[PDB]
Scaffold this active site. Structure first.
Site, PDB file in Angstrom:
ATOM      1  N   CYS A  11     -27.297  38.661 -14.050  1.00 34.58           N
ATOM      2  CA  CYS A  11     -28.252  37.415 -13.773  1.00 34.58           C
ATOM      3  C   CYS A  11     -29.737  37.949 -13.633  1.00 34.58           C
ATOM      4  O   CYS A  11     -30.226  38.775 -14.727  1.00 34.58           O
ATOM      5  CB  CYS A  11     -28.053  36.836 -12.371  1.00 34.58           C
ATOM      6  SG  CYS A  11     -27.507  37.872 -11.062  1.00 34.58           S
ATOM      7  N   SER A  12     -30.427  37.587 -12.600  1.00 33.04           N
ATOM      8  CA  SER A  12     -32.022  38.243 -12.688  1.00 33.04           C
ATOM      9  C   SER A  12     -31.904  39.647 -11.835  1.00 33.04           C
ATOM     10  O   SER A  12     -32.422  40.458 -12.368  1.00 33.04           O
ATOM     11  CB  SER A  12     -32.695  37.117 -11.980  1.00 33.04           C
ATOM     12  OG  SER A  12     -34.343  37.553 -12.115  1.00 33.04           O
ATOM     13  N   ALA A  13     -31.465  39.625 -10.579  1.00 32.27           N
ATOM     14  CA  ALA A  13     -31.424  40.683  -9.920  1.00 32.27           C
ATOM     15  C   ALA A  13     -29.999  41.727 -10.255  1.00 32.27           C
ATOM     16  O   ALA A  13     -30.080  42.716  -9.953  1.00 32.27           O
ATOM     17  CB  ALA A  13     -31.341  40.629  -8.401  1.00 32.27           C
ATOM     18  N   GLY A  14     -29.093  40.613 -10.673  1.00 26.87           N
ATOM     19  CA  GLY A  14     -27.651  41.556 -10.837  1.00 26.87           C
ATOM     20  C   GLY A  14     -26.963  41.728  -9.604  1.00 26.87           C
ATOM     21  O   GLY A  14     -26.387  42.655  -9.560  1.00 26.87           O
ATOM     22  N   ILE A  15     -27.198  40.533  -8.744  1.00 25.57           N
ATOM     23  CA  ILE A  15     -26.309  40.746  -7.552  1.00 25.57           C
ATOM     24  C   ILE A  15     -25.740  39.689  -6.903  1.00 25.57           C
ATOM     25  O   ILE A  15     -24.747  39.613  -6.548  1.00 25.57           O
ATOM     26  CB  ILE A  15     -27.028  41.670  -6.233  1.00 25.57           C
ATOM     27  CG1 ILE A  15     -28.328  40.813  -5.967  1.00 25.57           C
ATOM     28  CG2 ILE A  15     -27.541  43.178  -6.745  1.00 25.57           C
ATOM     29  CD1 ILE A  15     -29.186  41.591  -4.795  1.00 25.57           C
ATOM     30  N   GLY A  16     -26.298  38.468  -7.020  1.00 24.38           N
ATOM     31  CA  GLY A  16     -26.138  37.254  -6.683  1.00 24.38           C
ATOM     32  C   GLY A  16     -24.841  36.536  -7.439  1.00 24.38           C
ATOM     33  O   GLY A  16     -23.861  36.714  -7.138  1.00 24.38           O
ATOM     34  N   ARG A  17     -25.501  35.950  -8.451  1.00 22.65           N
ATOM     35  CA  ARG A  17     -24.553  35.108  -9.292  1.00 22.65           C
ATOM     36  C   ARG A  17     -23.763  36.170  -9.886  1.00 22.65           C
ATOM     37  O   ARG A  17     -22.459  35.723 -10.397  1.00 22.65           O
ATOM     38  CB  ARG A  17     -25.339  34.526 -10.324  1.00 22.65           C
ATOM     39  CG  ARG A  17     -25.967  33.205  -9.724  1.00 22.65           C
ATOM     40  CD  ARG A  17     -26.986  32.624 -10.683  1.00 22.65           C
ATOM     41  NE  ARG A  17     -28.291  33.602 -10.791  1.00 22.65           N
ATOM     42  CZ  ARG A  17     -29.368  33.198 -11.457  1.00 22.65           C
ATOM     43  NH1 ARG A  17     -29.468  32.024 -12.078  1.00 22.65           N
ATOM     44  NH2 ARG A  17     -30.490  34.227 -11.165  1.00 22.65           N
ATOM     45  N   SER A  18     -24.280  37.484 -10.373  1.00 20.85           N
ATOM     46  CA  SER A  18     -23.237  38.588 -11.071  1.00 20.85           C
ATOM     47  C   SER A  18     -22.163  38.972 -10.085  1.00 20.85           C
ATOM     48  O   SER A  18     -21.130  39.192 -10.506  1.00 20.85           O
ATOM     49  CB  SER A  18     -24.137  39.828 -11.336  1.00 20.85           C
ATOM     50  OG  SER A  18     -25.181  39.375 -12.428  1.00 20.85           O
TER      51      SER A  18
ATOM     52  N   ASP B 200     -30.121  29.989  -9.277  1.00 20.24           N
ATOM     53  CA  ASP B 200     -29.794  31.397  -8.105  1.00 20.24           C
ATOM     54  C   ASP B 200     -29.783  30.866  -6.858  1.00 20.24           C
ATOM     55  O   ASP B 200     -30.432  29.582  -6.589  1.00 20.24           O
ATOM     56  CB  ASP B 200     -30.952  32.296  -8.430  1.00 20.24           C
ATOM     57  CG  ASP B 200     -32.230  31.844  -7.274  1.00 20.24           C
ATOM     58  OD1 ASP B 200     -33.107  30.989  -7.877  1.00 20.24           O
ATOM     59  OD2 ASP B 200     -32.319  32.447  -6.299  1.00 20.24           O
TER      60      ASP B 200
ATOM     61  N   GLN C 154     -25.304  36.823  -2.739  1.00 17.85           N
ATOM     62  CA  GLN C 154     -26.700  36.679  -1.773  1.00 17.85           C
ATOM     63  C   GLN C 154     -26.677  35.804  -0.887  1.00 17.85           C
ATOM     64  O   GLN C 154     -27.689  35.896   0.062  1.00 17.85           O
ATOM     65  CB  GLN C 154     -27.934  36.310  -2.851  1.00 17.85           C
ATOM     66  CG  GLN C 154     -28.279  37.814  -3.667  1.00 17.85           C
ATOM     67  CD  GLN C 154     -28.738  38.592  -2.361  1.00 17.85           C
ATOM     68  OE1 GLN C 154     -29.997  38.215  -2.184  1.00 17.85           O
ATOM     69  NE2 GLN C 154     -27.938  39.461  -1.940  1.00 17.85           N
TER      70      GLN C 154
HETATM   71 MG    MG Z   1     -32.765  29.678  -9.982  1.00 17.43          MG
END
Ligand code: MG
Length: 298
Positions: free
Chosen positions: A215-222, A181, A262
């Site tokens: 992803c984890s939050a669904g905003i950065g990598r997604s 991330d 992000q």
């Molecule tokens: Mg990470």
């Protein structure tokens, strides 16, 4: 074309932090009153990452319809994505219910279950054929059918059964395993090789429901994955890369889900991936084989 010139100028000026920040200052602001209801507190992975009311995916079983997920509907590009957080121990039923109800065919997972010594996503799919998962609450059954493990991503074939109707669907699971991330991928090449496996599978076809990306939050990598695909599809439709404005696409995406992309570096990467991917879009079919070699899938 002009996308390339802009890139060179931002880099020769070091102003990526500024460019990224004024994107945040301009981004849409919409209410998330449902996500903030006390009954939904334990359905959100991050207090600060919530779906807008106007674009949230509603679950169809009429107890509580809430899931932390947004429908990104790109009108001009005519592609829809569902961006969602990594499921929590108690929302994996909801997640597969969403997949069923929305008629999605592919799930794009851009994180690992453990990242930086913490659980950033629940183990929401079975890891061995012989131990299927049954989600008692939502009446769904999930079997692992087969698994193709590459150097930096894994593709899995899952069978999702509606235990009510006994109808079964094939879900394809595309799992980028290489991508921490807040950082960009190592090269656009491995990233594009992955995006183009997703594309080639048909999971992004309009005959199916929206692809689910998390992803984890669904905003950065997604958000990185979704912005690159939409920009590529846009310049593909016009066959006129000149006319794609990445910042205006990002801001359109941010009408549907807060915080997409992000860091400044992820913004700069998006530019790199699109510029490189456009070589393919515009008729250099063999650059895709060239990405495959620089990706080093073992
Ligand atoms: Mg990470």
């Amino acid at each position: 074309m002009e996308m390339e010139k802009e890139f060179e100028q931002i880099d020769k000026s070091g102003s990526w932090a500024a460019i990224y920040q004024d994107i945040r200052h301009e981004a849409s602001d919409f209410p998330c009153r449902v996500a903030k209801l006390p009954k939904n507190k334990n359905r959100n992975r991050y207090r600060d990452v919530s779906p807008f009311d106007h674009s949230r995916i509603k679950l169809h079983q009429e107890d509580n319809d809430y899931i932390n997920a947004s429908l990104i509907k790109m009108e001009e590009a005519q592609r829809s994505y569902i961006l969602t957080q990594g499921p929590l121990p108690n929302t994996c039923g909801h997640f597969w219910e969403m997949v069923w109800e929305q008629k999605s065919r592919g799930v794009v997972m851009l994180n690992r279950v453990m990242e930086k010594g913490s659980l950033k996503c629940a183990q929401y799919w079975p890891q061995k054929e012989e131990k299927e998962m049954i989600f008692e609450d939502t009446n769904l059954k999930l079997t692992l059918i087969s698994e193709d493990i590459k150097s930096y991503y894994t593709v899995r074939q899952l069978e999702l059964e509606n235990l009510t109707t006994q109808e079964t669907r094939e879900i394809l699971h595309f799992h980028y395993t290489n991508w921490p991330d807040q950082t960009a991928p190592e090269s656009p090449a491995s990233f594009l090789n992955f995006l183009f496996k997703v594309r080639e599978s048909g999971s992004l076809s309009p005959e199916h429901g929206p692809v689910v990306v998390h992803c984890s939050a669904g905003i950065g990598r997604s958000g990185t994955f979704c912005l690159a695909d939409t920009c590529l599809l846009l310049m593909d439709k016009r066959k006129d890369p000149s006319s794609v404005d990445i910042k205006k696409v990002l801001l359109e995406m941010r009408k549907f889900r807060m915080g997409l992309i992000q860091t400044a570096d992820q913004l700069r990467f998006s530019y790199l991936a699109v510029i490189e991917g456009a070589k393919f879009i515009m008729g250099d079919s063999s650059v895709q084989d060239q990405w495959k070699e620089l990706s080093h899938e073992d």
